[PDB]
Design a protein around this ligand. Structure first.
Ligand SMILES: [Mg+2]
Ligand SMILES: [Mg+2]
Ligand SMILES: [Mg+2]
Ligand SMILES: [Mg+2]
Ligand SMILES: [Mg+2]
Ligand SMILES: [Mg+2]
Ligand SMILES: [Mg+2]
Ligand SMILES: [Mg+2]
Ligand SMILES: [Mg+2]
Ligand SMILES: [Mg+2]
Ligand SMILES: [Mg+2]
Ligand SMILES: [Mg+2]
Ligand SMILES: [Mg+2]
Ligand SMILES: [Mg+2]
Ligand SMILES: [Mg+2]
Ligand SMILES: [Mg+2]
Ligand SMILES: [Mg+2]
Ligand SMILES: [Mg+2]
Ligand SMILES: [Mg+2]
Ligand SMILES: [Zn+2]
Lengths: 36, 351, 140
RNA sequence: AUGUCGGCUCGUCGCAUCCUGGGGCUGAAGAAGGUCCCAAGGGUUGGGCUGUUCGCCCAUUAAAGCGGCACGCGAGCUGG
RNA sequence: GCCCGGAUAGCUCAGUCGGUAGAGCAGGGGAUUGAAAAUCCCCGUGUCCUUGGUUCGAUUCCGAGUCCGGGCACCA
């Protein structure tokens, strides 16, 4: 969810960068990552 | 043993329960929660293996004179084709029968018999010593490393205590039914007029298990507060958190310490105590467990025996099962493999 | 490997067959007869032999089926070919038993009607490999 | 000569949030929870024991938060 | 934590300038006894705690270490 190292966990997960913040979106919500 | 093994296994019972397995098995009733599936086939194999049992029986029954032709014809092959399926058979005959008995928790461990002389004072102290030589020789010739723990040679005769290790496999599972009271009737070699008196004894048996001693406590396992100590000290005692307090959350046991002026050395002494008092609750439960492994019986007085031994009427009546041999002398020297199986059969019966 | 409609392949032994463990629910779950199969099966097993016939059965609403029989797994013909009970646990190094460049060819003949490679060297190959598949080196 | 613990009185600031307001996950059915995020506006009880801070306990509560202020506050008090 | 004193047979303990090793007890084999005790002959086993060093050699003389025994840890 929220952390320092936001990486990938699928073959299905984009490294979206919105609002200076590096988020991470995947099909399954368990992979919804943000950085903080 | 060999001819009888069958019956007492659910010989006719199991072969009816067997299809009860597959019974509810088929028809996948919304196979949700996983449960019988596990003990589904494993319990099944048991079944049709009573045939492998009647095949190694038939192959070993059709073997009674399965050499009447080998008593008339020695060289051939039409007589050496079922044999490589007959040597292996006399093997499973024993297997599927003693692998149905020893079928319980931890038996393959090295055992630890203990002999304490019941009533009869000195007689019992001797009868005890005899019961010692017994299992010893037995386990000895039985291919078992026997290590002598204790031997307290009592007052006038015999012993008062004895404890020995039984190094081997299923040693416990074997010398397990022995655990219990053993009576002895014969004229007292000690009594004056060689009169006839009865002797009693206690023989406990347990598996070797614990070898190490670890008692480390994770930080989260506890809690540590710190406050201003109570006592002498002027400005000091007043403005310092020298007083510690370790609390072990699980047990709830807590320890406090203001021994020295150092919050630090006080945590130290603190835990030092905490540990000490934790092993005490660790050994208090470390034995209320292993002691409930002795049994729930044996008052070691009269009428508690589970197999008596007589010598002026040569026999040995096992009260537990009912069995009664006529060779006390042989039993007391090794002969046990007979009553050990039976002893189990009786027991394992209820599990 | 033809058409598909709730099919369910599975291997079976000699005449022995019906125990729920191997089969039983194996086809009874997809609604079918353990009856019209327990015997219907031993109608062709008793005829060809008594080993292990890979029979894949298809199913329809009429609890119907089309149990197509094939040659025993190339893993069987290779075993007895050297007298081995089990496989070998960890292959690639321990050759519990072994087979010859010919003994392999024999079997190849026995399964060539199932494969898709007429040639007898082509077939024998995907067999000689079946050795490295269970620790049974090829003699050659 | 910069009066030292706790209590009382008076507070105020922080957020690393105990309630209450929002929100993402969940091994979230629902009601309940768990974990992380946002968010101090306002709230955060009465007692038994001990000089106690700290704790334990009784009876509750939405919750009975953790700190900084010369471990705030003795030219404001107490003085166990 | 500091500073003293320890560890030697199965238990409790001596011992030497550096070569050696002991006592009482328990324990084993015998003897009286009807049978035990007591008593009476015969007995033996030890790295002298660990690990370094000095010496030609260390139980022994020094460094260190572990466990146990004492004594102190005070002014605020
Ligand atoms: Mg006694
Ligand atoms: Mg004792
Ligand atoms: Mg003072
Ligand atoms: Mg201070
Ligand atoms: Mg002034
Ligand atoms: Mg926040
Ligand atoms: Mg809910
Ligand atoms: Mg009050
Ligand atoms: Mg009071
Ligand atoms: Mg405050
Ligand atoms: Mg103050
Ligand atoms: Mg005063
Ligand atoms: Mg006063
Ligand atoms: Mg000593
Ligand atoms: Mg000498
Ligand atoms: Mg002496
Ligand atoms: Mg003697
Ligand atoms: Mg004697
Ligand atoms: Mg000696
Ligand atoms: Zn992903």
């Amino acid at each position: 969810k929220v952390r320092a190292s936001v990486k990938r966990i699928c073959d299905k997960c984009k490294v979206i960068r919105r609002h200076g913040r590096v988020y991470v979106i995947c099909e399954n919500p368990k992979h919804k990552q943000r950085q903080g | 043993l060999a001819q009888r093994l069958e019956g007492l296994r659910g010989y006719l019972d199991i072969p009816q329960k067997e299809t009860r397995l597959k019974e509810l098995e088929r028809r996948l009733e919304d196979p949700s929660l996983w449960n019988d599936p596990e003990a589904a086939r494993k319990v099944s194999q048991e079944a049709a293996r009573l045939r492998r049992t009647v095949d190694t029986f038939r192959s070993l029954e059709s073997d009674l004179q399965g050499l009447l032709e080998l008593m008339e014809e020695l060289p051939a092959e039409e007589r050496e084709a079922l044999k490589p399926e007959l040597e292996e058979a006399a093997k499973k005959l024993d297997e599927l029968y003693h692998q149905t008995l020893l079928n319980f928790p931890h038996a393959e461990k090295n055992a630890i018999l203990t002999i304490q002389p019941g009533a009869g004072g000195t007689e019992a102290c001797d009868w005890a010593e005899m019961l010692l030589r017994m299992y010893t020789r037995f386990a000895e010739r039985q291919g078992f490393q026997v290590e002598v723990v204790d031997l307290t040679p009592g007052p006038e005769a015999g012993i008062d205590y004895a404890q020995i290790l039984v190094k081997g496999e299923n040693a416990y599972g074997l010398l397990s039914p022995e655990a219990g009271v053993h009576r002895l009737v014969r004229p007292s070699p000690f009594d004056a007029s060689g009169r006839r008196h009865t002797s009693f004894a206690g023989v406990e048996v347990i598996p070797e298990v614990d070898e190490e001693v670890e008692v480390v406590l994770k930080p989260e396992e506890l809690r540590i507060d710190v406050m201003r100590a109570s006592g002498p000290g002027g400005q000091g005692v007043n403005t310092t958190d020298s007083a510690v307090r370790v609390v072990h959350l699980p047990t709830g046991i807590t320890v406090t310490c203001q021994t020295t002026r150092s919050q630090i050395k006080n945590k130290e002494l603190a835990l030092k105590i905490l540990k000490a008092r934790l092993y005490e609750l660790e050994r208090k439960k470390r034995e209320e467990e292993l002691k409930a492994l002795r049994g729930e019986v044996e008052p070691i007085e009269w009428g508690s025996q589970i197999r008596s031994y007589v010598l002026d009427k040569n026999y040995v009546k096992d009260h537990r099962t009912g069995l009664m041999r006529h060779d006390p002398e042989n039993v007391l020297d090794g002969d046990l493999m007979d009553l050990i199986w039976a002893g189990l059969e009786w027991k394992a019966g209820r599990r | 490997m033809k058409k598909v409609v709730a099919v369910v392949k599975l291997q079976l032994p000699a005449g022995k067959a019906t125990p729920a463990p191997p089969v039983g629910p194996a086809l009874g779950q997809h609604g079918a007869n353990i009856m019209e199969f327990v015997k219907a099966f031993n109608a062709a097993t008793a005829n060809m032999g008594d080993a292990i016939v890979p029979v894949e059965i298809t199913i329809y609403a009429d609890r119907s089926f089309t149990f197509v029989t094939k040659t025993p797994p190339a893993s069987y013909l290779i075993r007895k070919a050297a007298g081995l009970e089990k496989g070998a646990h960890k292959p690639g190094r321990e050759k519990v038993g072994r087979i010859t460049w010919e003994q392999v060819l024999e079997i190849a003949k026995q399964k060539m009607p199932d494969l898709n490679t007429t040639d007898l060297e082509a077939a024998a190959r995907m067999i000689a490999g079946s050795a490295r598949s269970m620790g049974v080196e090829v003699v050659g």
